[PDB]
Amino acid sequence: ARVKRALNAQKKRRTVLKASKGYRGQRSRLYRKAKEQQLHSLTYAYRDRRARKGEFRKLWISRINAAARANDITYNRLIQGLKAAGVEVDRKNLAELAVSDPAAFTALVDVARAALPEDVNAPS
Amino acid sequence: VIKLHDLKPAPGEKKAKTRVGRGEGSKGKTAGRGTKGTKARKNVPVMFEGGQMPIHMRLPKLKGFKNRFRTEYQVVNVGDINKAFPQGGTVGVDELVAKGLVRKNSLVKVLGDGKLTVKVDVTANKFSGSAREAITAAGGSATEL
Amino acid sequence: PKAKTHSGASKRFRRTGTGKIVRQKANRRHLLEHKPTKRTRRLDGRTTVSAADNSRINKLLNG
RNA sequence: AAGUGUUUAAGGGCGCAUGGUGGAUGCCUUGGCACUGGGAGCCGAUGAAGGACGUAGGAGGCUGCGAUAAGCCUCGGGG
RNA sequence: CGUAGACGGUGAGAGCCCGGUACGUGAAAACCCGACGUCUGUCUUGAUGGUGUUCCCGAGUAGCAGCGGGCCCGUGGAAUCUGCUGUGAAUCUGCCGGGACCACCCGGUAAGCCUGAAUACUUCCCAGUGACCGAUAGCGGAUUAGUACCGUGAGGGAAUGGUGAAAAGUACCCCGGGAGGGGAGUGAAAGAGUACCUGAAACCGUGCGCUUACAAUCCGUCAGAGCCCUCGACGUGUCGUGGGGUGAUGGCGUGCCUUUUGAAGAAUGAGCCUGCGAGUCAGGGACAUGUCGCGAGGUUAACCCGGGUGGGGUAGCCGCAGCGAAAGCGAGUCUGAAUAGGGCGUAUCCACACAAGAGUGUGUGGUGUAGUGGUGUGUUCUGGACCCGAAGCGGAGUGA
RNA sequence: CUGUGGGUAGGGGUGAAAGGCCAAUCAAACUCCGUGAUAGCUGGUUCUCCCCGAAAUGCAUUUAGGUGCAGCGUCGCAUG
RNA sequence: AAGUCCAAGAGUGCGGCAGUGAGACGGCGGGGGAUAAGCUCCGUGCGUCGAGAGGGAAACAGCCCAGAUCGCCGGCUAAG
RNA sequence: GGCAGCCAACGUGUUGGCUGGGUAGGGGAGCGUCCUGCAUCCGGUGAAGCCGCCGAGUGAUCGAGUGGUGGAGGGUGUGG
RNA sequence: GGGAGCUUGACUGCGAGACGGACAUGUCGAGCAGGGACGAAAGUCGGGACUAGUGAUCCGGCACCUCUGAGUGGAAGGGG
């Protein structure tokens, strides 16, 4: 019962080559070299998909900090004041307001500043 | 009806062969052998113990001889006799074999302490003291033939 | 090809009625003057094979 | 007055289209392998096994055949 | 209607088209086994069933000794058989074997003897078969194959199959010296053109889209500007749950494998692609894990019959019991001069008694103990034994 | 010094002796076979996922880069 | 005595089928060394790496935080 | 929000609640290939193979979806 | 530890129970035979104050045995 393994081999070969389509050099042409990069490509995809949440939170925080200091308040005290006021708007939508609705962001900044303690540095 | 395509093995009858050394998702690469060594490429003999005196060489040989002339007997118990012959009657090698209490061609030795409660004319090659006592108490007759 | 039994193991080990593999004990062949009779009594008779060696002794006896 | 600003490709990359090379794949087979059941189990100085050289109208190989040389005779089968 | 749907071929799956197949059957000659003949020794020419005392009747052998061989037997207590060396037996009151010997004996009659058919194997021939290979496979050999080629030689030793149904194998014209093409034609198809079935990858181009010449890049991944196509509100380009690319720019990012404490590692291997390349098989082998049959039973091996996978086949094997070295009993046994004192066994589990708290026993009753043969898979045994690799060893030859 | 024709062949030959030479190979030539020698040593051992998941210790070892046993990983028992 | 309560994936015994028996560094207790070594050899219900990704240590197996079932245009924190 | 053992349930036991980094290695369950018993389907009104499009599954992978090339086989189920 | 008597615990031969330490090793209660001391007095005391003073298995001896005895009326040829 001799079995030729072309039918079975070419399946995974085509899978990896189609996945690596677009890679520069041997990585898009040779299955073996594509496979090495595909291991790296999918490890990177997993890692960057985990880290994308942190990266986008960093972007949102930078934009919120810019808007806050444009409103004359630091990002840390803005977050403290929003938490004290009970505003549960995530940083994603805070940055969305900062960009698209600066008036609403200023209103939230006023809410946060009002909710902040009379003395943020007090021993309390 | 039941055609040939309706035949299947019993649940749990057939098990897939462990096809070893086929990729890392199964027992791959070393194929369950681990890294280098003797056992990585062959089987170590069972009698080998690393070079120290093996157990089968440091232990004394069992004492005695085998006595190629030993007269071993196929034993029957009077309890088996009761189970086989609830009504009584003559008992010998032929009907002991028929009831499946002894090998077909062997020296039968009757014996027993399992409450023989039937009058039986038992004819075996030999009897034990308790065999004779039980046969007599039940009212039978032991005969060595 | 029938599995040959190990001759030395067959000559050194025995199985009881319940299947316990039994063996004799070493240090009781000679040089017995200095061995107290308590020691030779300890070394006398047969003892069950240790559980560690039971597997290999069974292997040698069966094949 | 200062600042902003697309716009090139010698070549390269990626992709798609379309080709070439190559001979994988699939489907096959003239050939092998392992056996089964039979036959015959020896050939040779009446020159064996195996060959060299020849042999067809035309060159060579394989096949057949030996100066009677892809062949001669007899007896059968077939058209 | 086929007592003939075996298998092939034929322009694609044909029982009815062809070769055939089931079966009307056939041999002049030659060669193989049968019946009757010619042909070939022994008797009636007193044996033949009984009678009876005494005499004669298989050698350099048997035996023995030394040294070896072979037997389970490795020289051992070493029998039987046997080589060589030496020494060497009578006639049945003999001799030899039973693993010394009186012998109770039994068996048989060596050497002088000789002689039969019934079981292994396949170069070759015939007919077949395959949960065998299908062109890197299968024979080394589907092709010039033991050829080409290599070697002085022994010897080593390849590669090379597929147009099409049918050559219908492209007339004719044109470019070209040709080769090779373009028309034309053949063909179902030249997306079949003797470079020919399909025509993968590597590899090499050409065209188009995006991108790229201030940039430090394991070559990707996450965001992501800018550059074309699929449905529509709307009437027309800006949207979308929509749908692919290309990638300015930013973040992160130290190949794979092996082997290591640890490798991106400046340790190993890999230039690339395609194809091939490594735990397999035999055996009532051994040890462990679902099913038939039991009811203590399971099974057959060889073999016989069946045109098969079926039916027989009890020999044997394993359970059926143990303790003992053995002699011995029996759930007992062995050790024990010592009904004195213990190990191994009596499946297991219940209850009731008597002894016990040295932790549990001894009896009594009650359930009645489960191994075995196929095939389950994993290990293991003897085989090369998952695969590859030495230097070297041996035998027989080839080489001055 | 040379041509031709011879002879010596592998544990052997030949050697004004270097272990030199014996067909580009010599501390035992080559070919085939034993043979798929053997190697505790390198290397390789090919699809997937789910559950669990080590060791680099002890003893012994003609043993120390090997192996046996134990320790440590992997189903059914008893255990709650 | 409790606690761990849809059990630890616990301990024990018997059969699994193993590989492992080259360890590394760090903290503590030590030997050898010069109380040197990223040295060497021990002990440590000590850790981690081995076999462990993620964050911090600029990079940086063994340090610190923390054990990755998979996704998310979410939130809170660990060490820093 | 999605996926993998144990627990409760009342009833057909599939619902809900307690669960998972991994080298050697063990166990379980599967993907794909070929050859086959039987069953059943597709195929010159175009099988396989190959190149795509569109998609799909937790993975191996899928394609009785589809276009091109192609020219004769192939798929599915359950067993070996 | 130091002296003395016994006449030979010079306590040896059969040894439940327990145990400590992989095999190997090591501890003893206790029951029986026979004894030694102490005896009135009890009925009590198993080589040396204890840990080293040793070598598995194989193979062979040598004494004893209620074992075997390769057809045996039987013995010679092995075992405990």
Q: What technique determined this structure?
A: cryo-EM
Return positions of chain D under 7 A from a protein CB: 13-16, 24-26
User: Resolution, rounded to a tenth of an Å?
Assistant: 2.6
- Provide the domain limits for residue B132: 74-142
Q: Inspect the interface and report whether the beta carbons of B61 and C11 lie closer than 8 Å.
A: yes
Q: How many domains, in total, are found in chain A?
A: 1
Q: Which residue has the tokens 């085509």?
A: A14
Contacts of C16 (CB under 8 A, 6+ apart): C22
Q: How many domains, in total, are found in chain C?
A: 1
Q: Which of residues 64-103 of A touch strand D (CB under 7 A)?
A: none
Structure tokens, B16: 């897939």
Residues of C in contact with B59 (CB under 8 A): 12-13, 23-26
Backbone angles phi, psi at B117, to 5 degrees: -130, 35
Return positions of chain F under 7 A from a protein CB: 39-49, 60-63, 65-70
Q: C1' nearest to CA of A27: which nucleotide? A: E219
Could you say which DSSP state residue B4 is in?
A: G
| C14 and B CB contact within 8 Å | yes
- How many Cβ contacts (< 8 angstroms) between chains B and C? 44
Closest CA to C56 of B48, A13, B62: B48
Q: Inspect the interface and report whether the beta carbons of C56 and B59 lie closer than 8 Å.
A: no
Cα(A76)–Cα(A90) distance, rounded to whole angstroms? 14
- Provide the domain limits for residue C16: 1-63
Q: Is the CB of C2 under 7 A from strand I?
A: no
Measured at the alpha carbon of residue C27, what is the angle toward residues C16 and B54, in degrees to the nearest 5? 70
Hey, how many other C-beta atoms are within 10 angstroms of the C-beta on B60? 15
Contact between residue B114 and residue B133 where contact means Cβ atoms under 8 Å apart: no
- Provide the domain limits for residue A116: 1-124
CA–C1' distance B42–F37 (Å)? 16
Q: Inspect the interface and report whether the beta carbons of C56 and B60 lie closer than 8 Å.
A: no
Pair type for strands B141-144 and B120-124: parallel
Closest CA to C61 of B132, A52, B59: B59
Pair type for strands C13-15 and C47-48: unpaired
DSSP A19-78: HTTT-STHHHH-HHHHHHHHHHHHHHHHHHHHHHHHHHHHHHHHHHHHHHHHTT--HHHH
Strands lying side by side in the sheet with C21-23: C13-15, C21-23, C47-48
Which CATH number does the domain housing residue B138 bear?
3.100.10.10
